[PDB]
Amino acid sequence: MLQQPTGGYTTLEQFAFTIRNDGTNATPTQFLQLLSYEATENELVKKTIPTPETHLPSARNVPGNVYIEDAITQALFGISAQNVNAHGYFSRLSALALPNTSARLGLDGVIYNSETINIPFYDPAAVANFAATYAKLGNASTPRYRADMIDIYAHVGLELAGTDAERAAGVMPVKRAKFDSWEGSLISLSRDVVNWKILAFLIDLCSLEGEALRAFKTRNRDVFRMMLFIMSTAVAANVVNRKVTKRVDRVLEYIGVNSMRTAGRTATITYDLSRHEFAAKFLQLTFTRWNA
Amino acid sequence: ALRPELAFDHDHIIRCLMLAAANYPRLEGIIVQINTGYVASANVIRPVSE
Amino acid sequence: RYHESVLEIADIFDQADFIQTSDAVRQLRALMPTLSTSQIRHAIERIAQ
């Protein structure tokens, strides 16, 4: 077992998030520095997020070791993720939510039912806190519990493109992102993010309280912004290149506006409707936690 | 849904139609034929005998 | 006292949008005999063939 650092597991260098920028390693924040926005006539107002359902998927026993980290990251950032809403994994996550479970969350992000001492794992109280919310990813597809797939993206845009004044105001002009870019920059970035050990991020997001959680939110705001960026490219209506002075600038219109696009395209990853449900639910939970 | 083909190049095509219009006398007739066939296919008008 | 040499338009204009070729076409043309308009038509009809 790994004891959680007072700053959270993300303080550990083992869980550091990084993205190649035209193939060289870089912190997400300094990729976000390359981003630039051209505002348009439309506006994003942020409606309040409906509070997530109290209900959890039944903590049913399942054979095998669920790979929950890869499931979430693939559902959010992977190329053509499949079976994103298959219930079993999440039932196991709910089993992690239980007060005295034998289940463990390995730092691999695999969920083990047995207490396998050879494999290091996150502190059970912390994963209980994390699963207690995130198992609700399990009812992403049930009609009773589907998250808004449209309005939530306002928040995404606000947390990505939004200037501190706009984030205070809660409204921003709908924006067209752009950055000097290499071939396949959005796919490569998405690959760089899908490899992230995000369970440390979410576990810290749930278990941490007071000053520690706030310092975590400031230290990690750019990470969350990179995740939001990958999602936004997945849902942006249109993505193109612009040749300028022998440099291609990638352009994504528009940030904060979910187009509900489902057909795959070269430029970016793509959400099938099931992926859309999943991401919407994930955003509901994650923003509900981030804004508190 | 992706169609694995090149985009219809509006600009290049219009430029080439201009070039052909300036150099290829048959062009007019070609386009007309298309239109003619279309009218014929729409069955909008036929000559009656009387 | 001078030095004749090809100077690509690209070394002058900073706008890449309107520059499609380079010195190479000039050199290749220098290889061609001067052509009467009918010889030009013959070349084009041949390539068309």
UniProtKB/TrEMBL annotation, chain A:
Protein name per UniProt: Viral structural protein 5
Record lineage: Viruses, Riboviria, Orthornavirae, Duplornaviricota, Resentoviricetes
Residue range from the parent sequence: 1 to 292 of 448
